[PDB]
Amino acid sequence: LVSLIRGQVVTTDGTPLVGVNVSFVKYPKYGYTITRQDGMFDLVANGGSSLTLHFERAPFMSQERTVWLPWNSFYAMDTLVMPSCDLSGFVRPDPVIISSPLSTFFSDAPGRNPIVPETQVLHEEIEVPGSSIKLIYLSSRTAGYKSLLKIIMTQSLVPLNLIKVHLMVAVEGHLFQKSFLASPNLAYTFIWDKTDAYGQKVYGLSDAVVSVGFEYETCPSLILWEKRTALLQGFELDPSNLGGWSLDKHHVLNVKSGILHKGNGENQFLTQQPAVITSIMGNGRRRSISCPSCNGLAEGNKLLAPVALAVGIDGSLFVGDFNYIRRIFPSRNVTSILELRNKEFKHSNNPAHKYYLAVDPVSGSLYVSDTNSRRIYKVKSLTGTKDLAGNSEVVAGTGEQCLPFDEARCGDGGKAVDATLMSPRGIAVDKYGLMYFVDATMIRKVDQNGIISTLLGSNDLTAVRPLSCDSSMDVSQVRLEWPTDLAVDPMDNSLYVLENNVILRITENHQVSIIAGRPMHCQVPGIDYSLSKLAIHSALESASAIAISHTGVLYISETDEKKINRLRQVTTNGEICLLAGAASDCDCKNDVNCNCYSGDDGYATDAILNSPSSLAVAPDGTIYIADLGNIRIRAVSKNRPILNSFNQYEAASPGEQELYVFNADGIHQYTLSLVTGEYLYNFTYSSDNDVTEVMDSNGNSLKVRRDASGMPRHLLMPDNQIVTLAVGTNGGLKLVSTQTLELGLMTYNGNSGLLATKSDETGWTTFYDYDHEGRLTNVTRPTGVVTSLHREMEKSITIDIENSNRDDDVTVITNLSSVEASYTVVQDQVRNSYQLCNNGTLRVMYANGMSISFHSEPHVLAGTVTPTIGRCNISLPMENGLNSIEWRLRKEQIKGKVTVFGRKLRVHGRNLLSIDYDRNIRTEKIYDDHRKFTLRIIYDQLGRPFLWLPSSGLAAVNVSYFFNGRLAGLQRGAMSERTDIDKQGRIISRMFADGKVWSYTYLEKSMVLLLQSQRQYIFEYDSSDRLHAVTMPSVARHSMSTHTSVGYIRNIYNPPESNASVIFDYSDDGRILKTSFLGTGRQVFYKYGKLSKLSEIVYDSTAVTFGYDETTGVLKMVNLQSGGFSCTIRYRKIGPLVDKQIYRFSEEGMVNARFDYTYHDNSFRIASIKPIISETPLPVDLYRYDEISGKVEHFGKFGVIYYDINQIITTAVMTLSKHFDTHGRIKEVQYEMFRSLMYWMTVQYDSMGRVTKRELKLGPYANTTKYTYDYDGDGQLQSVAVNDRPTWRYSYDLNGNLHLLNPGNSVRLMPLRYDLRDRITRLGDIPYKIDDDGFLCQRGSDVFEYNSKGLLTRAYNKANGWNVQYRYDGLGRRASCKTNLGHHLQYFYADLHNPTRVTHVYNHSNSEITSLYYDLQGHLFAMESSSGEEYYVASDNTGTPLAVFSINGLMIKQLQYTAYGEIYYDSNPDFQLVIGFHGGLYDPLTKLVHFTQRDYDVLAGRWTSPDYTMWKNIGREPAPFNLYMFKSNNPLSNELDLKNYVTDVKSWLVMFGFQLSNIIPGFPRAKMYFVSPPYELTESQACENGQLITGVQQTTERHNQAFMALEGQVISKRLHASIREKAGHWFATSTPIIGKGIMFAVKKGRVTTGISSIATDDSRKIASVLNSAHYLEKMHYSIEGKDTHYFVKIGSADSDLVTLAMTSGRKVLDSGVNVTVSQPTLLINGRTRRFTNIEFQYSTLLINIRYGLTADTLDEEKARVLDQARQRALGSAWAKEQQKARDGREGSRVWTDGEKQQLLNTGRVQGYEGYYVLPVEQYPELADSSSNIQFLRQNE
Ligand SMILES: *[C@@H]1O[C@H](CO)[C@@H](O[C@@H]2O[C@H](CO)[C@@H](O[C@@H]3O[C@H](CO[C@H]4O[C@H](CO)[C@@H](O)[C@H](O[C@H]5O[C@H](CO)[C@@H](O)[C@H](O)[C@@H]5O)[C@@H]4O)[C@@H](O)[C@H](O[C@H]4O[C@H](CO)[C@@H](O)[C@H](O)[C@@H]4O[C@H]4O[C@H](CO)[C@@H](O)[C@H](O)[C@@H]4O[C@H]4O[C@H](CO)[C@@H](O)[C@H](O)[C@@H]4O)[C@@H]3O)[C@H](O)[C@H]2NC(C)=O)[C@H](O)[C@H]1NC(C)=O
Ligand SMILES: *[C@@H]1O[C@H](CO)[C@@H](O[C@@H]2O[C@H](CO)[C@@H](O)[C@H](O)[C@H]2NC(C)=O)[C@H](O)[C@H]1NC(C)=O
Ligand SMILES: *[C@@H]1O[C@H](CO)[C@@H](O[C@@H]2O[C@H](CO)[C@@H](O)[C@H](O)[C@H]2NC(C)=O)[C@H](O)[C@H]1NC(C)=O
Ligand SMILES: *[C@@H]1O[C@H](CO)[C@@H](O[C@@H]2O[C@H](CO)[C@@H](O)[C@H](O)[C@H]2NC(C)=O)[C@H](O)[C@H]1NC(C)=O
Ligand SMILES: *[C@@H]1O[C@H](CO)[C@@H](O)[C@H](O)[C@H]1NC(C)=O
Ligand SMILES: *[C@@H]1O[C@H](CO)[C@@H](O)[C@H](O)[C@H]1NC(C)=O
């Protein structure tokens, strides 16, 4: 094409000349330029060919300079200044060039984590109301984000004579020059502003030319130069033009650089993807020698034998097609230009008849050199004349072969035409027009005059020295053995020789050196470290051809003709890698049944070549291969989108299942579904190509209302809502707002475009700091938390990530090479490795020992432009640990259009599942390979799934949509739930299939949910749709608030007319830190360690530690320590899988346990469990599975049969048959023993899935009992009839409290009483007591002791004389139960998939172990004793045991329960059953059923504690609720949820018994929990999963998720409006003390504040006072409900009092913040002190500052706050102890009658004092905790 030249002309000193006439003459093209004051010359010339330039000046010598021009680039010419010394064996410069990585990383959740560590990028977002389209900010899409180039020119060792080092950097016309002095480890970092020489923005990717010169003391005039190329990222295109922000769905394609810039922040550098191979000439068949119809199109045109290739100055490819020389024009047409009369059809593949081509860059002359004719020819006419046989002229040679020892030296010194040649081989023509050629074993020159000479002069055997491995010697010392190909480097102007599998370089200074290949001089032990990526250390296997690109890249052809047929690439850095040609399993030359032609229109590295003979590099950088064996010319091109028949470009995202359509200019037209082919988004533009409308598939249009210049004004949302956009004078988006909400408020750093601040409606301001390079260095939050990023750019780029509040330091190390980008994420000694290879492979090597390898293939629909993960190879650290998953993609085309898109999932060559989409009928067929499962998903005209048609006669699921595409209703047979919406899109009605209607009324931020029973719930909201208050039907108002605190976000819930606050403290990343119950003082502290995983849980006097392995990072230990008692759980793992679980106890009587696990070969499936309880080995339980479905076929002694969705559990003795209805609900259970029916149950449901009828037969001879259930207007259980006779009646409060029941078997109707907080107070005559935290305290004479974690530690009754104590493990599970009546049991959890499931019970009274066996629904069905006894359990639809049968099929126990779980009949009370009502642990003493997180009272029919986490989502999903009610007062039916409407393939598969989790490693296992497990338990399972801190970790996750995706499209199953959710913010935000626009940072306990433009004057006053203060770390407490934080200031308060404009008292600011100035006098440990005290307070948040002058000020305040907290802890502990004595309850210590009386009268006991159990020195957070205090006398 066309190139641009730019250079400077200077004098001797360095002054630019004001008058130089720069001239150039080439073909008919003429031109000249005259330099100005700057001394710069700018010229336009044709690229590729060599151009000579003349310079004219008056008092200076007129000089000429010839240069090799790049094809279509901006050439920066060397500076012009207006020979005796010889450097041989001197050290050449070997620079290490490190470029800043490409911005390929982005965030999956910019709202959760905006930090991209590796590229130091800020990825932010703004959610807008009325649309799912977001506004995205990416800090790399700015002017401030510069391109870096670290050039390490010297190492630790400097050559002795080196004095000066010179540097040159050439980027887009710019020429940077700098001189340095010789120093060890000398480096310079070049910064590019992404502009050209004219100050214009450069888009995409650019090439930099780095030149390093070495000046020696021996010769100061000459400098040893070395040229290297580097890739620099330019400006990213801005598609949306919204003040530096983009629309989430709006993309742009850079057509020139081949980059897909997605609006969501995702950048796809398409040219950096695997290279593509295509056939440009030939059809694999030979043409006739006469060449008939050889003049036409190149593609498919028959060849004979392509032996030579050369690219002309025109861009034409000259083909040495044996007999004829054919020219391929840029128009892709072929014309024969020369016929060689000495070529015969027989000698086509003969090496003796092989000739070589070369193009002269001065004049486009083509030179031919035939080895057989012993001459060199020049083609006369390159257009081809009539007589083609005589279109050549002799350049060199007469035709006769001269003898090796010629006297006249084969005509040297004279004319080339008259001279004689030995055997001419490879030819190359220099920049100056000098012709070079290989003549037998030497290199000969043919100059401009026509005189022949010898460069590498042979026969001088005396001066010849063997080839030096490291140093470079002169031409005279070099001897050549079998040289073939020759080429000139268009960047160096050096000559490259291919000689006996070694490539050598001849510089312009006649210096020879090895560039590629390993000679026998230093073969072994030449290199001790062996394998390396360098070309010098890699041996060449039968090399045949060489080619050099204009960027100095060397390509080497290697052909063995048998199996080795490949093309390798050698980059400027000296690294060698495979470019094309896979290793063929078949012999191409010997084997007759062989095809060595494949891979065309696919990836080059996968393709199989056959005998490559010649290479040539095209103007665009594509490599041409003379594939002689396949009679074709093949092209290895950069991966690029191709213009289709419609003049459009197509790119795709397989992960999002989207296809993007762009016009010829790369402007985004449409987004279609990659599966469905239906339009998802349509983009319309203005005349200036500015985006004005985004129209989705549903008809929702988001209009961008613009100005005539394209300036954005506002967004017109699909609901006709206006979102105001205010762009600043710097061009940056300043404000995003609605008529009520301020969605975003942004400031920028000058005109760089770098986001300085970003605020939301809550007033939360985040501050961003960058370095001079525009890389993110700090992120400061209003919590005072700072995230810091530090870069160290060396041979490897290291980024250090630190947080001010945590010790979780993360470091990312990046090593970029020719083959791969290598990443290492380090957390202490735990190292995770990631490798992103050029072939498209992503390899993860986890610290745990497991490795995952994702492999890319071209997409079947989108082509080579989009690689897809079609293979996944997993490796576990074990004997048979290799696993493999495969996705096989297919297509069906009718009339050139896609009809069917098929995907098949395979494991070890077997089909598991097939997901096929038929575009004609709009159906998605999901089917099994063995006729077991079939599901059809029907899509509507808008491309939305609306109907799910399953097999086995199951009820179909169908959905309704509103006009805007939002889900309107769901239906599954007779069951349906519909909604109606406002004009505002708010739900106004909710209709159920039973006729139940809920109304939703909206009145000024308040919502009123009314039921037909006239029960009313009022939800009061914020502008941000977060709850302020909830009024219950009882008219009791619950209140909530959220506020930014110091180091966390505090969420407060206040019960009605109470100050007993329930607080949930969350970190900035959304992790729980503290759970507080201010009513009694209950606290749970959560700590996170160096691996960013849970490290400690502290509550009361109990400390739970989580130990991780120093190297693997896996959870090794969980240790609970509560004084003397210790409970330790230890794990051993095979990668992330548990293979050993140990239980250890410190207690005297308690027994230990061990569980050994084995896994099935080549899987993640558990094969066996071997238990050892109390050093007594138990029998091994074997697990057998179906390899196609993951179905458990055998477990222990039980066998499982699957038919449709029904299951049969069999043994030689028993058969348990479970029958399910069309809705997947249990309809019949049939338990048979010895071919006789022992138990049968039938369940019948109403339209809504409520149990209406249950028939039960308990025993083979017992009668059948019929139970009928009736529900009230709200679906609450009203009555229960036994054989059509009313037996039970239930009634409820307006709040849903059960206030009337028939207890047990009684006819009597008993009333239940409640308080305003819904806490029970009475059950008939029996009084109940619930504490201020909401926990069960007393039931008449029964006393209950619940700890801070909400676990029952002790329960007793002094009157009835019974006492029960419980012990728990570190994961919150009940470990033991011990009574004063002899009972002592221990519980174990051996099931890895169900960690809350009690699998084994150790009984201390008989020393026997009971093994519990559960069915596929989780219900108990069998038991096995270590004594040899076997029991068979009959369980109901809720998993409640109703009957037990002996080993001989005899009913030994029969239970009858009420609807709420109270036992009224027991045939054998002495037979103790561990599992009770609803599958929990039933206690006959307490009458409670224990589930790991909550306890259930069977007498009251409610939970013993509230689930305060309900408050988190009740605002988003408003519904009738009660904190204590059991299953919405429907205890026999499965809880009603939207999950009952099966709208996803994985959920349909689960129903059919399929367990994809067992066959697809990593696939999510379906959760089988009634009660949600505690945080630490779910965390202990998920901690083995890969972290997501860095960008490479997030890239890996995208690969994992895209591989596990089943359906082509998934619906958003939500019948509620989408709410903008913040991390750790649950409720309506309280006004912050740290105002909007104020920066607040707490680094190592030191406070620093900053101010932005938007900050108010009163907010700046608080900032000024808080600056330079010292925060009392870990010493912040909840005092009288207040979130009090302590600070100290060393100096006088005078300066700060002037700022506050006050002297003393209280002042109220504009925000409402209270400022109190006082001078208190404190008495701490007998020491009196008076100081100034400034207090800042808003609602519960309180910030206190103490002023001092001494250095001990911080230490004195620490001693003051701890003593005050000690007084609070002691005051509370003694009060609680006195209350225990008053109530008649058992105290913490055993007191005598005198001690007890002293406590009752005074409040304290003489000689006794409260001491900390957990030391306050290590646990300062427990300083005010009364539950951490123990009363002891001085005897200890
Ligand atoms: C942890 O370990 C603990 C052990 O350290 C463990 O506690 C022990 O648990 C077992 C099993 O539950 C207890 O044994 C039971 O004892 C029952 C009490 O009966 C006593 O009183 C009677 C007087 O009224 C005596 O006649 C009777 O004597 C019999 O037992 C003696 C053994 O001590 C023996 O030497 C005698 O020869 C004599 O046979 C005894 O002293 C007892 O009732 C009970 O038996 C029933 O249950 C067995 C299964 O558990 C059946 O195999 C057996 O056939 C019995 O069933 C019948 O009775 C039930 C209840 O009435 C009915 O539900 C049945 O349908 C059935 O009824 C039919 O048959 C009757 C005639 O047999 C007839 O009258 C009916 O009309 C009907 O036709 C069992 O042996 C043991 O005492 C506990 N030990 C201690 C120290 O606590 C604890 O459970 C473990 N915990 C966990 C969680 O695992
Ligand atoms: C699911 O499909 C059924 C059809 O099988 C839809 O039911 C129809 O609903 C209309 C009212 O909208 C009634 O007039 C028809 O009589 C119903 N058809 C029959 C015979 O079932 C139903 O609306 C769909 N459900 C949802 C929520 O999309
Ligand atoms: C909830 O309110 C009660 C009553 O206002 C507070 O209890 C009082 O606290 C003061 C100071 O500690 C004592 O002098 C009183 O004797 C207490 N009254 C009684 C009878 O308890 C209580 O501290 C408040 N709690 C919270 C969480 O703010
Ligand atoms: C600023 O301080 C005043 C006074 O301490 C707070 O007002 C008191 O609020 C309580 C509880 O709402 C009332 O019982 C008192 O009667 C109020 N006293 C006065 C004199 O107003 C006020 O709430 C504080 N401001 C904020 C936003 O926390
Ligand atoms: C290329 O060759 C075809 C014959 O195969 C001919 O029809 C066409 O006109 C040619 N085009 C050019 C570039 O002259
Ligand atoms: C920002 O981070 C760097 C990390 O090298 C640190 O040196 C610096 O003190 C930080 N500054 C702020 C704003 O805390």
Residue numbers in the entry: 956 to 1037, 1045 to 2798
Authors' text:
The Teneurin extracellular region defines its adhesive specificity and controls both homophilic and heterophilic trans interactions across the synapse. Here we present X-ray and electron microscopy (EM) structures for two out of four Teneurin (Ten2 and 3) ectodomains, revealing a ~200 kDa super-fold with a 170 kDa rigid core. Eight sub-domains, of which five were previously unreported, form an intricate structure centred on a spiraling YD-repeat shell domain.
Here we reveal a conserved and surprisingly compact domain arrangement for the ~200 kDa C terminus of chicken Ten2 (Ten2CT, residues 955–2802) and mouse Ten3 (Ten3CT, residues 846–2715). The structures were solved by X-ray crystallography (Ten2CT) and single-particle cryo-EM (Ten3CT) to 2.4 and 3.8 Å resolution, respectively. It bears structural similarity to transthyretin (TTR)-like domains and attaches peripherally onto the super-fold. Indeed, the Ten2CT NHL provides an extended crystal lattice contact between adjacent antiparallel monomers, burying ~1100 Å2 surface area (Sc = 0.46). Residues E1306 and K1308 of this alternatively spliced region form multiple hydrogen bonds across the interface. The Ten2CT FN-plug and YD-shell combination encloses a volume of ~130 nm3. In Ten2CT, the ABD is disordered in two of four molecules in the asymmetric unit.
